């Protein structure tokens, strides 16, 4: 037991699970991540054909300039100006709070951080996809296969010595000829190597491995080069946007050798890498309700064949019909990779045992669900939710035990709108969520080893990061000609007097009372949210949505002595090992 | 300097030499080993006549069953069952700690790993000799010439997936007429080829080249076939403990054409292969104190002649009287093969320059020296010692600079008993040592380019791998009838709490306090130790001695991210080279 106030102004019993999560994650990654995997799949610079503007012009997301926006920061003077920034361009970080906003030219629909290995102190990058058009929308049952652009954005190193005056740099983009990308998952560890690694001139040092869940119904696997390694090969007369057309390492698809009929699987809707070394398997959820596994190292002539360009086509080794409808989500269990969870548009969650796929461990019928988080330390899964079937006022975010403990679902955050995304930081045991109301919240989970019904009130464990509002000033032009975005950002510096601070009141006046908006584009809506997976920057969070603006925030109040020590202790071992 | 603790629980400054040694060895082997040598000396199956069990029995070691023993492991509740296993029987690997034990039928007196090319991932073997009798002992002055058996033991492949449930398999042995064997060395590189190599029916894919220091005063040079090719040639009805009468590739002896007088050199006592490409020279130490060199490719009719069976006889090209008494050890410099070091029963370590053999580079007088190790990165030599002349309590293991740096001898490990054998791992930068006291000790050397007196307490840099004891429930039978061997192993997985864990507190009574046994067989004495020279399995170690039991260990705490990184990069390159 513990009592009194933590240095950040939360009670110690609210912080104590967070500190426990650091040790469990540090211990886990030492055991079950690795520093190198897939040595065979390093980049080749001659496969990265830089496009001219004439060739690139079809792929660029079509809005050249952001909506007008403004930022108010809690406790600071009111800015009163309106900002508006070009596509592929960024405002500068606020000098004290280091929040950044950058514009991707289209509404964001996938987002993930590159996993830099532990304490390596590297430059930090987010990959993202923003749809070509702000108001185009895609029916699930149809394969789209249009043109679209994967974007990689560099954020600097995000050390305190770097964050004041930081900017997001669009380092390069990959032209994808495979339509919308619905999910991005980097290989969790073992894909990255040092940017100055000595390699023969074509073999650019590898930044990571990125899997793309395409609306074409297939998964593309790219190994990424470091940006400066490209420019060292690239001619210096290049276009300012560094747009590339790129060959896959592999295209993953569902089928068989000589399969005559293209599969009914439809769109690929979700991904998960195997969370443990050697990360050899990838799972994807399809529209037909299947979950499909490709064995990436597979030598076998039955799964692997090489296309005339040299990319691999991989067919799966295992499929099971997990759901009666689209498999909108997957999470793979970190603590034991024989277990998996999936949630589908049939509004069942199903936990799975991959050795015995004929029945789930536990099906729990629920409201329609949009994303799952399965944090390492906890037996259950947290669900983001669509309100369309909820009891009114009881929609929101729910933590659901996998069933052995049998606690009732912990109602961590009531929301009136739908929640489009979750991310759980293993370093924090926090969960953050993006809402169509344009509000971003974070919550600290109670220690789910102990019955959550003993929690006196969940409201003490959550705080808003920001809310977007529209200020007047059913399509994008009918909106942006008549409104600007206001971002209201909280003082994340500490949580003293939290329940009386005005933004925390403002959020509570949104809960239970706020109304769905249906007479405009819902430009405020936040689609994806991601805590940093990296121990360096572990307290950084990135989010964006229907505005196509992407914002980076630092949740300074969860920067803590144990984290800072663990960063430096890990820093020393890295520099003692890799130099 | 670097501060903090590595995740294995050793300080980073203690481990930083161990990590550095991987890079230095890799750069050396890229430049100075080779993929194929002695292309003419491919094994021919018709030279391998399989003995029946009736023919083999005179060559078989006379003990059909091991001494009784038990094995104990730090942190596992004690087993205490008394094992007793037949000649050529292996116990099964411990499912998690992967230690393996098997009985050779006699006391172990020679041992080396088969050198597997970097990245090959091959089956991993030890070739060994074990004396015909547990209690018989041979006078140095005499050419014993009694028959005995060279043994080849396959250890499986030591891949992570293969280590649980592994066993050591006696794949075959060679019936040797030329006396007992005092030393075994493989051709350090370029002998191995793929077991799947297509070759004509008389040829067999070559496992290695092996040279024997016979007590008959001559050196036997064998090319080993891969076992599968023998078993494909062998009739399947034959006895699977296959014992072959093998014709030598070459027989190496001191003399000249028409030299009627048999050489006074007596027994051969130590070998060194030329450590660098093309490995053309083999050096041997002799009882009369000479060091003798054969140029194995030699065409010259003055050095090479072919016997009627087609085996070679080679006379040397150069000799010198290095010592006043038997040359107990040779070590040949890897960094520059002009230099060689030797030790002898006259208890001087002499560093030689083989261009100028009349005067050693340096002669340092010491205690009676039993084996030397010369790790690639370090200028000096580490000496194992008999205690019979030592200043009391100062016996044990010393590292001795070749003299330019001029440091005092680094007293790396005090021992009461005589260290019978020593082995460095160039990959690890660490050394291990077998004692009549029955401990196996391993120790980490500092960066010997810097003054070792800066090491304030070397006890922080060593650990006991195991101790062998006799438990009472002058000859072998009168011993085993009243005692059994207890092997107690440390938890090699990490070095946390090391200086508090009971094996160190026990070992600190082995140092200094331990009263040496002299009144029985010394049945616990460890006569040989060998780290693996192979990048695959580089953290594995083999040991054995008067018990006739081999035991194998994996020093899990020293295998590291750089080891895994390096293994995979070498695996990718090797797979790109051989297909």
């Amino acid at each position: 037991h513990c009592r009194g106030m933590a240095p950040n102004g939360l009670p110690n019993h609210i912080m104590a699970p967070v500190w426990k999560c650091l040790h469990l994650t540090k211990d886990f990654r030492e055991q079950k991540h690795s520093y190198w995997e897939f040595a065979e799949w390093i980049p080749l610079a001659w496969k990265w054909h830089l496009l001219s503007e004439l060739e690139a012009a079809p792929y660029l997301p079509q809005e050249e300039k952001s909506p007008l926006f403004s930022v108010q920061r809690e406790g600071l003077p009111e800015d009163g100006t309106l900002y508006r920034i070009n596509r592929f361009s960024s405002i500068t970080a606020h000098p004290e709070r280091w929040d950044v906003s950058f514009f991707t030219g289209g509404p964001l629909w996938a987002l993930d951080w590159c996993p830099v290995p532990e304490g390596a102190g590297a430059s930090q990058y987010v990959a993202l996809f923003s749809s070509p058009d702000m108001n185009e929308t895609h029916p699930l049952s149809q394969l789209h296969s249009g043109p679209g652009l994967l974007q990689l954005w560099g954020l600097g190193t995000l050390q305190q010595e770097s964050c004041p005056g930081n900017r997001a740099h669009f380092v390069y983009g990959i032209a994808c000829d495979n339509g919308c990308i619905w999910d991005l998952k980097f290989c969790p560890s073992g894909a990255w190597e040092l940017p100055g690694t000595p390699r023969k001139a074509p073999l650019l040092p590898r930044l990571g491995l990125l899997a793309l869940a395409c609306s074409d119904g297939k998964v593309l696997l790219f190994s990424l080069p470091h940006p400066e390694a490209l420019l060292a090969q690239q001619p210096p007369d290049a276009v300012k946007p560094a747009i590339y057309k790129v060959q896959c390492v592999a295209t993953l698809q569902v089928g068989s050798m000589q399969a005559t009929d293209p599969s009914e699987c439809g769109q690929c809707l979700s991904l998960a890498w195997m969370p443990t070394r050697p990360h050899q398997h990838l799972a994807a959820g399809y529209y037909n309700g299947m979950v499909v596994f490709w064995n990436l190292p597979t030598n076998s002539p039955l799964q692997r064949i090489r296309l005339s360009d040299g990319s691999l086509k991989l067919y799966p080794f295992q499929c099971f019909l997990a759901h009666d409808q689209a498999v909108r989500t997957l999470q793979w269990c970190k603590a034991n990779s024989h277990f998996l969870v999936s949630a589908g548009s049939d509004r069942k969650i199903k936990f799975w045992d991959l050795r015995r796929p004929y029945e789930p461990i536990n099906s729990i019928k629920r409201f329609l669900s949009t994303e799952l988080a399965w944090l390492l330390p906890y037996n259950g899964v947290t669900v983001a939710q669509d309100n369309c079937y909820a009891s009114y006022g009881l929609c929101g975010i729910h933590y659901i035990d996998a069933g052995y403990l049998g606690f009732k679902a912990y109602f961590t955050a009531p929301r009136k709108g739908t929640v489009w995304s979750l991310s759980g930081s293993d370093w924090l045991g926090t969960i953050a969520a993006g809402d169509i109301s344009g509000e971003l919240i974070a919550a600290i989970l109670p220690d789910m080893a102990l019955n959550p019904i003993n929690v006196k009130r969940p409201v003490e464990r959550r705080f808003p990061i920001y809310k977007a509002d529209l200020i007047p000033y059913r399509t994008y032009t009918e909106t942006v000609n008549h409104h600007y975005l206001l971002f209201q950002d909280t003082d994340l510096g500490s949580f003293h007097d939290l329940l009386r601070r005005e933004p925390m009141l403002r959020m509570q006046e949104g809960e239970g009372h706020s109304q769905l908006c249906l007479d405009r584009l819902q430009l405020e809506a936040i689609h994806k949210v991601r805590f940093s997976p990296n121990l360096d920057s572990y307290g950084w969070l990135v989010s964006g949505g229907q505005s196509g603006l992407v914002r980076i925030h630092f949740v300074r109040g969860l920067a803590s002595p144990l984290g800072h020590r663990m960063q430096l202790e890990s820093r020393a071992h890295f520099n003692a090992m890799f130099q």
Side-chain angles (χ1 to χ4, degrees), chain A:
Chain A
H1 185 51
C2 63
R3 64 178 68 173
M5 201 72 72
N8 66 6
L10 284 168
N12 284 313
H13 70 274
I14 296 187
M15 287 302 298
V18 182
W19 298 330
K20 199 185 309 296
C21 292
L22 287 168
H23 300 307
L24 289 170
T25 304
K26 182 55 159 49
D27 297 349
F28 163 78
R29 291 192 182 197
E30 283 177 20
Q31 293 160 12
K32 278 175 168 67
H33 280 184
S34 63
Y35 284 84
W36 195 240
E37 299 302 334
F38 303 103
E40 184 174 22
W41 293 349
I42 50 176
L44 281 163
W46 65 260
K47 301 198 304 184
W48 281 69
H49 176 197
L50 180 80
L51 301 191
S52 63
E53 291 190 333
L54 176 63
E55 289 158 306
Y59 301 100
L60 310 186
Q62 291 184 17
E63 299 310 323
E64 296 180 353
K65 305 183 75 77
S66 74
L68 287 89
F69 74 94
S70 60
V71 187
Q72 285 177 13
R73 297 185 177 81
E74 179 189 3
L76 272 65
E78 290 175 20
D79 180 303
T81 73
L82 302 183
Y83 299 80
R84 176 157 56 169
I85 69 187
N86 294 340
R87 180 180 66 206
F88 315 125
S89 192
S90 178
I91 70 173
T92 301
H94 182 278
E96 305 178 39
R97 298 194 180 170
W98 314 333
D99 73 273
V100 177
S101 307
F102 64 93
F103 184 60
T104 65
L108 180 146
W109 271 112
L111 171 61
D112 200 14
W113 292 82
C114 183
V116 170
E118 200 160 283
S123 45
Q124 301 287 337
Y125 302 86
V126 297
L128 64 89
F129 168 86
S130 294
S131 180
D133 177 312
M134 292 289 185
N135 68 72
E136 187 161 45
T137 177
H138 303 83
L140 284 170
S141 60
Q142 294 289 0
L143 304 181
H144 183 261
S145 79
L149 180 66
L150 174 79
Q151 307 177 20
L152 184 77
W153 288 77
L155 309 185
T157 177
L158 306 176
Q159 313 316 307
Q160 175 170 12
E161 298 94 320
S162 173
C163 299
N166 189 31
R167 303 184 77 179
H169 299 112
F170 173 58
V171 289
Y172 53 83
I174 303 181
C176 287
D177 201 27
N178 292 287
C180 297
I181 311 302
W182 300 129
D183 207 11
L184 292 176
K185 295 284 157 58
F186 285 89
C187 177
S189 80
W192 181 105
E193 62 180 353
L194 282 158
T197 300
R199 291 194 177 285
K200 305 304 299 182
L203 296 171
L204 307 186
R206 192 168 65 181
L207 174 60
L209 274 163
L210 177 62
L212 295 88
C214 300
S215 59
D216 191 52
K218 56 172 56 60
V219 172
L220 313 174
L221 185 75
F222 296 133
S223 57
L224 297 186
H226 281 273
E228 282 67 34
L230 281 168
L231 269 63
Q233 201 83 341
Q234 183 208 80
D237 301 333
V239 179
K240 290 294 191 291
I243 310 299
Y244 293 79
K245 187 181 296 181
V246 179
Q247 299 194 17
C248 306
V249 175
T251 64
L252 274 59
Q253 59 175 265
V254 58
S256 309
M257 302 302 173
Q258 293 77 44
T260 187
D261 185 22
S263 191
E264 297 296 350
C265 288
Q267 299 200 64
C268 186
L269 297 169
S270 190
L271 282 163
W273 287 82
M274 182 160 143
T276 60
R277 182 199 298 198
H279 309 296
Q280 75 278 26
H281 300 314
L282 187 73
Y286 273 98
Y287 176 74
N288 77 341
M290 287 202 158
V291 179
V292 177
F293 299 77
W294 301 270
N295 176 16
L296 291 173
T298 189
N299 280 314
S300 68
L302 301 178
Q303 292 157 41
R304 181 183 61 98
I305 187 61
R306 194 180 298 271
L307 302 185
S308 60
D309 67 3
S311 65
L312 298 182
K313 177 169 62 179
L314 297 186
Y315 297 129
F317 70 95
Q318 175 179 358
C319 314
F320 55 84
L321 186 68
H323 281 273
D324 307 314
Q325 196 148 348
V327 189
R328 298 301 293 274
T329 65
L330 295 178
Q331 284 292 138
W332 206 324
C333 188
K334 287 167 180 164
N336 182 326
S337 307
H338 294 294
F339 307 109
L340 175 148
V341 70
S342 63
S345 188
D346 64 0
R347 73 184 190 93
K348 298 179 184 80
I349 299 95
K350 293 185 182 184
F351 295 89
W352 293 102
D353 182 341
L354 301 182
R355 300 167 296 171
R356 292 179 293 228
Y358 50 76
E359 275 205 32
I361 282 169
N362 187 353
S363 296
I364 177 169
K365 194 171 182 180
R366 208 72 189 162
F367 315 114
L368 180 63
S369 52
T370 55
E371 193 147 63
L372 304 178
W374 194 347
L375 284 161
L376 167 69
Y378 303 135
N379 191 54
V381 162
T382 308
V383 186
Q385 191 166 295
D386 180 326
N387 59 4
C388 56
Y389 312 136
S391 302
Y392 190 64
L394 296 100
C395 189
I397 307 170
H398 286 277
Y399 168 91
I400 296 177
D401 181 46
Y404 171 82
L405 303 170
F407 312 135
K408 284 286 180 285
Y410 174 71
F411 192 9
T412 182
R415 306 300 302 168
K416 294 286 281 205
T418 69
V419 177
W420 274 120
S421 49
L422 300 187
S423 177
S425 178
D426 305 286
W427 301 111
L428 295 173
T430 54
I431 290 185
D435 181 331
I436 56 175
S437 182
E439 187 162 52
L440 170 67
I441 69 168
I444 298 158
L445 295 185
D447 182 358
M448 306 298 184
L450 302 177
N451 189 342
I453 299 299
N454 298 338
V455 173
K456 286 181 286 283
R457 61 191 70 78
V459 66
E460 290 183 64
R461 297 180 188 258
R462 75 172 91 100
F463 52 93
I465 299 184
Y466 71 88
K467 183 177 188 306
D469 299 315
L470 281 162
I471 308 302
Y473 169 73
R474 300 206 68 200
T475 188
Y476 181 91
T477 293
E478 290 185 353
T479 307
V480 178
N481 290 8
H482 293 281
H483 297 272
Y484 64 81
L485 290 170
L486 170 60
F487 298 112
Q488 307 200 50
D489 298 357
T490 62
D491 178 9
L492 298 162
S494 76
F495 310 114
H496 298 84
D497 207 16
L498 175 61
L499 265 62
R500 305 197 306 156
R501 279 167 54 187
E502 182 160 42
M504 184 62 178
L505 269 60
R506 188 202 54 54
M507 183 183 76
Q508 290 168 92
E509 297 314 315
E511 299 182 359
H513 171 69
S514 185
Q515 303 294 291
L516 177 68
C517 175
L518 290 168
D519 66 326
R520 58 166 189 254
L521 184 59
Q522 307 161 348
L523 199 79
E524 300 142 299
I526 297 174
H527 297 168
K528 299 289 184 178
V529 174
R530 298 294 175 243
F531 274 108
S532 176
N534 299 326
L535 173 56
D536 176 26
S537 83
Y538 80 105
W540 286 84
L541 176 150
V542 66
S543 61
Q546 179 60 84
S547 60
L549 285 163
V550 184
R551 300 196 66 214
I552 299 151
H553 291 275
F554 184 55
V555 55
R556 186 182 302 288
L558 301 178
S560 68
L562 290 174
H564 187 64
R565 287 186 64 75
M566 187 177 291
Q567 283 175 339
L568 294 171
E569 291 296 312
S570 194
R571 189 77 49 64
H573 174 259
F574 191 78
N575 287 335
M577 182 170 279
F578 306 92
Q579 298 183 346

